[PDB]
Amino acid sequence: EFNILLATDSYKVTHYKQYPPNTSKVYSYFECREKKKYEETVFYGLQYILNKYLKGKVVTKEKIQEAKDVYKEHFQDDVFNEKGWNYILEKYDGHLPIEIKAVPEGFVIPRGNVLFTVENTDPECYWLTNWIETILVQSWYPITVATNSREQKKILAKYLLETSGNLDGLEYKLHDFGYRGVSSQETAGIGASAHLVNFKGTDTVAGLALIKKYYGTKDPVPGYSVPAAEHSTITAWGKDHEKDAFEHIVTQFSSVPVSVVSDSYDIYNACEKIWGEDLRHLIVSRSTQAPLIIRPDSGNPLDTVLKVLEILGKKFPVTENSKGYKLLPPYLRVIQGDGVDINTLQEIVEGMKQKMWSIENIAFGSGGGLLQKLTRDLLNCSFKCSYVVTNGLGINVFKDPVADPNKRSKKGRLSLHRTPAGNFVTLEEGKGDLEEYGQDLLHTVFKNGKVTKSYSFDEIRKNAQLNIELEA
Amino acid sequence: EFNILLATDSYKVTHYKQYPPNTSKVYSYFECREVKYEETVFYGLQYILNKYLKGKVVTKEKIQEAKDVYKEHFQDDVFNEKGWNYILEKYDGHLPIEIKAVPEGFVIPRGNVLFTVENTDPECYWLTNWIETILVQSWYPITVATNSREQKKILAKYLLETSGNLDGLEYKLHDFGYRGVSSQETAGIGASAHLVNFKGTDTVAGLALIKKYYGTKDPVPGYSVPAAEHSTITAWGKDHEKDAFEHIVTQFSSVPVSVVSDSYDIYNACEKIWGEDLRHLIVSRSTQAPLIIRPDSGNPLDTVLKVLEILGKKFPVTENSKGYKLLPPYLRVIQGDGVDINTLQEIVEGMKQKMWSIENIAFGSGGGLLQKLTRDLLNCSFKCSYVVTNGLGINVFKDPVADPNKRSKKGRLSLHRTPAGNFVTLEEGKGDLEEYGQDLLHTVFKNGKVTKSYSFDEIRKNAQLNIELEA
Ligand SMILES: O=C(NCc1ccc(S(=O)(=O)c2ccccc2)cc1)c1cnc2n[nH]cc2c1
Ligand SMILES: O=C(NCc1ccc(S(=O)(=O)c2ccccc2)cc1)c1cnc2n[nH]cc2c1
């Protein structure tokens, strides 16, 4: 069983001895700090943390004893606020005396804004606010996944709209291939959920159960997939029988979409001779609802996509859509599932546009780039104390390191507001209380061990919509 | 509860329908194919076997749940309920799979077989690659352990050069990554991988992982000491940084204590607060209880060098037997910002150029140590090499025209010692020729049971540096 007393950075175990004496309140906040191409961030993932780790009876006498035993050895010393944790167990039946206020999940907010705040609701527990920094700060991950994935949707939407005149199929244009390429099962479920904020295609099955249990959708499931080959299911036929494997596979899955990896030996041969001649009669007969999706998986991503499109365009009948771009027949599409990240995604669609290929021809699969190749530095996700009450006097506190202004933190009690032009501003020094802006956009989501305000996955998807989708 | 029927890539649910008819065996292997990372530490498969693969992993409830989920996920019924029922009925839900693997902690050059997977029942030919996804997650502990060991090699080189010994090495790179990884589970796994090489960690989650899955003779495998954060300094108010420092070092007067010193002005803090106002409370400390000053901002090399220069003018520096400058034993520095393998190398080299011993410094690394890593670094990859269809074995492989680096190995594999004492991977069942002695892989899982396992102490021993072996 998870133990909250063992889920912090070692050194925070020692912080209750370090705050000013006579401190009754420690108030802290999280922001994606501005760095003076990710100017706004999707806030998503805190509700998972709240429910899985923070709510309810999270302190027991056994958990207190276990932590005591581990820390004695880990520090070779007895430092460990047993009394403080006992107090929570005795007075509040092990529920955390904490209040967290947060912008609504799905909200899209420019950098350098307060996204959530954390404070203790009992003076005895001034040390508890920053105890839970470590676990709360892991929110960086679903925020960053959701944000990076939304930025890739923006690129796709722009190029799809330019080359086709509409957004049809956008929500299936970046599929999650990341299950194997992330660091753990738990990471899998959280990352795949964050991607589904923006798209509907996933092979990372772990995300589905996460969303059902912590967020929920009207629909049975949040994300979808279709049958597809891997190198094993082709190479197992023998080097001389790739055509046999292709023929068997597309015939097995004759009435649904099916994607077939085509680069086991020579992708260009497979497209031109195997699909484009030997097995062509099995492809041209397919339903628009059941295309063959050819998948290259090696070579320079851009050069390979362009050469595969050139090959297919000569073996299959291509049309020119109303915007002037070339379009494969509806029973044939391509997915590039190797080497995709936000930078290469952009290079490919721009490359396709230069060569007059519509983005309606293509979809992308991304694994490590989507779910693993991200860090807390990308959006400068950071948690800092801004306000403390000592001797009954509040003071506004901050860091401001001389050699890096970008690390200066905000001061005092914070609130998030709509500006007169309809943007966002964070008010410092308790200035929200002056009521010169509308209401504070942070809402209490957790208080004294109970989750107080929750969002469905459907609402979150609504909140994270692109401006061009809204315009449609 | 974890469900192995729901822990694979979606498309693998459909693979049972795509292998050649009459296939009875699918045999697959994992390798790290191909800043140089020429050799990898194999670590973390044992966690996965125990936590996810062993024992009764299939129930009637788990089958029905998978069934229900895939029906919606595919908008169709493609799930192999019959195949999964066969496991439940025939084997009480234990996986009929055999996995052979090199010993954990082993340090093996790139491009060698590390583990192999095959079904032990012909009906379960499809199961070998169902569990690709979960097994390939081993890339993460391997890669963390490996990059952490590469950093240890750098620190050893320079500590040996500037001090004449390796005293302190195992505490020179501390894990600060708990908040910077993608999840709790990731925290425990990657912290454990770093502890293969070092003993300093703040990522508490690794301690219970190691105790449950590997074990150590010692009560715990990793340690920490008291330290401030910005909140415990800034809470005193901007004009009271001195007061905060004094309170903290007096609270922790007889154990090591680290104090972040750049909340406002790191160079002021070192020269005037520590070096003048509070100097009398630092020069009185025990060798066993130093103050460890922590910068946390600015250019990491420039800041370390200026911090050491400031301190060397306020405190009595000696010159050790190698000609390098050393702080008094009650004073040390830790650089815990911007540290990855590249900046770690830049800092130690810049210290060496300025005649500072590496004894003076320790490093903390978070995102750089535990999160800034992918499966592409070591090219961790799982592929089928051998299948039996209609009773005939065939050697199979991929060989993409545009990328020879992605070519995979062929046939039944085994791992051998060469006449010169190195590793070689034999393909095509050639290990059976008996020209290169015994297979170095061991059966670690068979039919639901873990059959061979390693303590964390053995793993640490296997993972030692050659410089460490030398004296
Ligand atoms: O093909 C794979 N999964 C199946 C798959 C996934 C996505 C598509 S798609 O073209 O985006 C598509 C998605 C939804 C509906 C129609 C078409 C088609 C097939 C696949 C392929 N390679 C992978 N490596 N790692 C995980 C992987 C998953
Ligand atoms: O200082 C921190 N942790 C305590 C700590 C860690 C490491 C050392 S050390 O100087 O390497 C040391 C380790 C072991 C024994 C003696 C000295 C001293 C203190 C710390 C500081 N910043 C952090 N950010 N994220 C996690 C963090 C942890």
PDB file of N, CA, C and O in Angstrom, chain B residues 58-84:
ATOM      1  N   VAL B  58      -4.246 -14.455 -14.908  1.00  0.00           N
ATOM      2  CA  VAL B  58      -5.457 -14.507 -15.732  1.00  0.00           C
ATOM      3  C   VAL B  58      -6.563 -15.047 -14.848  1.00  0.00           C
ATOM      4  O   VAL B  58      -6.355 -16.029 -14.163  1.00  0.00           O
ATOM      5  N   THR B  59      -7.712 -14.381 -14.831  1.00  0.00           N
ATOM      6  CA  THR B  59      -8.907 -14.876 -14.130  1.00  0.00           C
ATOM      7  C   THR B  59     -10.112 -14.782 -15.065  1.00  0.00           C
ATOM      8  O   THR B  59     -10.038 -14.140 -16.124  1.00  0.00           O
ATOM      9  N   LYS B  60     -11.247 -15.366 -14.677  1.00  0.00           N
ATOM     10  CA  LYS B  60     -12.438 -15.196 -15.526  1.00  0.00           C
ATOM     11  C   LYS B  60     -12.848 -13.720 -15.581  1.00  0.00           C
ATOM     12  O   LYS B  60     -13.253 -13.226 -16.639  1.00  0.00           O
ATOM     13  N   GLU B  61     -12.720 -13.019 -14.452  1.00  0.00           N
ATOM     14  CA  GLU B  61     -13.093 -11.610 -14.397  1.00  0.00           C
ATOM     15  C   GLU B  61     -12.200 -10.782 -15.334  1.00  0.00           C
ATOM     16  O   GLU B  61     -12.671  -9.875 -16.007  1.00  0.00           O
ATOM     17  N   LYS B  62     -10.910 -11.099 -15.383  1.00  0.00           N
ATOM     18  CA  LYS B  62      -9.984 -10.301 -16.201  1.00  0.00           C
ATOM     19  C   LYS B  62     -10.216 -10.481 -17.682  1.00  0.00           C
ATOM     20  O   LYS B  62     -10.058  -9.538 -18.461  1.00  0.00           O
ATOM     21  N   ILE B  63     -10.590 -11.696 -18.065  1.00  0.00           N
ATOM     22  CA  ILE B  63     -10.926 -12.025 -19.442  1.00  0.00           C
ATOM     23  C   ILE B  63     -12.176 -11.265 -19.855  1.00  0.00           C
ATOM     24  O   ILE B  63     -12.200 -10.610 -20.895  1.00  0.00           O
ATOM     25  N   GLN B  64     -13.212 -11.337 -19.029  1.00  0.00           N
ATOM     26  CA  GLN B  64     -14.452 -10.622 -19.383  1.00  0.00           C
ATOM     27  C   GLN B  64     -14.261  -9.102 -19.486  1.00  0.00           C
ATOM     28  O   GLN B  64     -14.860  -8.447 -20.325  1.00  0.00           O
ATOM     29  N   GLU B  65     -13.445  -8.548 -18.599  1.00  0.00           N
ATOM     30  CA  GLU B  65     -13.195  -7.119 -18.601  1.00  0.00           C
ATOM     31  C   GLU B  65     -12.481  -6.702 -19.887  1.00  0.00           C
ATOM     32  O   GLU B  65     -12.821  -5.676 -20.486  1.00  0.00           O
ATOM     33  N   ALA B  66     -11.467  -7.470 -20.275  1.00  0.00           N
ATOM     34  CA  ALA B  66     -10.706  -7.192 -21.491  1.00  0.00           C
ATOM     35  C   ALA B  66     -11.595  -7.250 -22.700  1.00  0.00           C
ATOM     36  O   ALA B  66     -11.521  -6.403 -23.606  1.00  0.00           O
ATOM     37  N   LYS B  67     -12.411  -8.294 -22.719  1.00  0.00           N
ATOM     38  CA  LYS B  67     -13.415  -8.521 -23.755  1.00  0.00           C
ATOM     39  C   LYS B  67     -14.304  -7.290 -23.946  1.00  0.00           C
ATOM     40  O   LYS B  67     -14.462  -6.772 -25.057  1.00  0.00           O
ATOM     41  N   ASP B  68     -14.857  -6.825 -22.838  1.00  0.00           N
ATOM     42  CA  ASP B  68     -15.760  -5.685 -22.822  1.00  0.00           C
ATOM     43  C   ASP B  68     -15.061  -4.413 -23.282  1.00  0.00           C
ATOM     44  O   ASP B  68     -15.629  -3.611 -24.019  1.00  0.00           O
ATOM     45  N   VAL B  69     -13.820  -4.221 -22.831  1.00  0.00           N
ATOM     46  CA  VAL B  69     -13.078  -3.014 -23.239  1.00  0.00           C
ATOM     47  C   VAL B  69     -12.664  -3.035 -24.713  1.00  0.00           C
ATOM     48  O   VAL B  69     -12.850  -2.053 -25.406  1.00  0.00           O
ATOM     49  N   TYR B  70     -12.137  -4.155 -25.214  1.00  0.00           N
ATOM     50  CA  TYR B  70     -11.722  -4.228 -26.617  1.00  0.00           C
ATOM     51  C   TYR B  70     -12.931  -4.115 -27.591  1.00  0.00           C
ATOM     52  O   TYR B  70     -12.823  -3.563 -28.679  1.00  0.00           O
ATOM     53  N   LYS B  71     -14.085  -4.620 -27.170  1.00  0.00           N
ATOM     54  CA  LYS B  71     -15.282  -4.504 -28.033  1.00  0.00           C
ATOM     55  C   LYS B  71     -15.539  -3.026 -28.376  1.00  0.00           C
ATOM     56  O   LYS B  71     -15.802  -2.685 -29.538  1.00  0.00           O
ATOM     57  N   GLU B  72     -15.409  -2.151 -27.375  1.00  0.00           N
ATOM     58  CA  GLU B  72     -15.598  -0.712 -27.612  1.00  0.00           C
ATOM     59  C   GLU B  72     -14.384  -0.038 -28.278  1.00  0.00           C
ATOM     60  O   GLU B  72     -14.516   0.786 -29.189  1.00  0.00           O
ATOM     61  N   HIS B  73     -13.190  -0.431 -27.833  1.00  0.00           N
ATOM     62  CA  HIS B  73     -11.949   0.178 -28.308  1.00  0.00           C
ATOM     63  C   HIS B  73     -11.748  -0.082 -29.812  1.00  0.00           C
ATOM     64  O   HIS B  73     -11.308   0.811 -30.523  1.00  0.00           O
ATOM     65  N   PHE B  74     -12.133  -1.283 -30.305  1.00  0.00           N
ATOM     66  CA  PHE B  74     -11.992  -1.628 -31.725  1.00  0.00           C
ATOM     67  C   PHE B  74     -13.308  -1.482 -32.516  1.00  0.00           C
ATOM     68  O   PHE B  74     -13.315  -1.638 -33.755  1.00  0.00           O
ATOM     69  N   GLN B  75     -14.387  -1.179 -31.801  1.00  0.00           N
ATOM     70  CA  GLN B  75     -15.731  -1.185 -32.402  1.00  0.00           C
ATOM     71  C   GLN B  75     -15.973  -2.518 -33.105  1.00  0.00           C
ATOM     72  O   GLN B  75     -16.631  -2.598 -34.152  1.00  0.00           O
ATOM     73  N   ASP B  76     -15.444  -3.573 -32.509  1.00  0.00           N
ATOM     74  CA  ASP B  76     -15.576  -4.887 -33.071  1.00  0.00           C
ATOM     75  C   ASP B  76     -15.086  -5.927 -32.091  1.00  0.00           C
ATOM     76  O   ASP B  76     -14.422  -5.599 -31.092  1.00  0.00           O
ATOM     77  N   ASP B  77     -15.394  -7.189 -32.387  1.00  0.00           N
ATOM     78  CA  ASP B  77     -14.948  -8.289 -31.556  1.00  0.00           C
ATOM     79  C   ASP B  77     -13.768  -8.994 -32.207  1.00  0.00           C
ATOM     80  O   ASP B  77     -13.938  -9.791 -33.141  1.00  0.00           O
ATOM     81  N   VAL B  78     -12.568  -8.663 -31.740  1.00  0.00           N
ATOM     82  CA  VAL B  78     -11.337  -9.230 -32.284  1.00  0.00           C
ATOM     83  C   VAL B  78     -10.569  -9.835 -31.136  1.00  0.00           C
ATOM     84  O   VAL B  78      -9.646 -10.627 -31.337  1.00  0.00           O
ATOM     85  N   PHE B  79     -10.972  -9.520 -29.918  1.00  0.00           N
ATOM     86  CA  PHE B  79     -10.255 -10.104 -28.765  1.00  0.00           C
ATOM     87  C   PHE B  79     -10.217 -11.670 -28.704  1.00  0.00           C
ATOM     88  O   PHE B  79     -11.237 -12.327 -28.869  1.00  0.00           O
ATOM     89  N   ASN B  80      -9.022 -12.247 -28.511  1.00  0.00           N
ATOM     90  CA  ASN B  80      -8.830 -13.710 -28.402  1.00  0.00           C
ATOM     91  C   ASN B  80      -9.279 -14.296 -27.032  1.00  0.00           C
ATOM     92  O   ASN B  80      -8.449 -14.726 -26.224  1.00  0.00           O
ATOM     93  N   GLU B  81     -10.585 -14.301 -26.761  1.00  0.00           N
ATOM     94  CA  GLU B  81     -11.099 -14.835 -25.521  1.00  0.00           C
ATOM     95  C   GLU B  81     -10.746 -16.333 -25.345  1.00  0.00           C
ATOM     96  O   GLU B  81     -10.385 -16.762 -24.252  1.00  0.00           O
ATOM     97  N   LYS B  82     -10.870 -17.106 -26.422  1.00  0.00           N
ATOM     98  CA  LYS B  82     -10.546 -18.549 -26.439  1.00  0.00           C
ATOM     99  C   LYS B  82      -9.103 -18.864 -26.038  1.00  0.00           C
ATOM    100  O   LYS B  82      -8.854 -19.733 -25.204  1.00  0.00           O
ATOM    101  N   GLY B  83      -8.157 -18.180 -26.671  1.00  0.00           N
ATOM    102  CA  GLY B  83      -6.755 -18.297 -26.273  1.00  0.00           C
ATOM    103  C   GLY B  83      -6.492 -17.983 -24.804  1.00  0.00           C
ATOM    104  O   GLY B  83      -5.738 -18.712 -24.119  1.00  0.00           O
ATOM    105  N   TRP B  84      -7.054 -16.891 -24.301  1.00  0.00           N
ATOM    106  CA  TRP B  84      -6.859 -16.544 -22.882  1.00  0.00           C
ATOM    107  C   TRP B  84      -7.603 -17.506 -21.957  1.00  0.00           C
ATOM    108  O   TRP B  84      -7.119 -17.837 -20.893  1.00  0.00           O
TER     109      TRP B  84
END
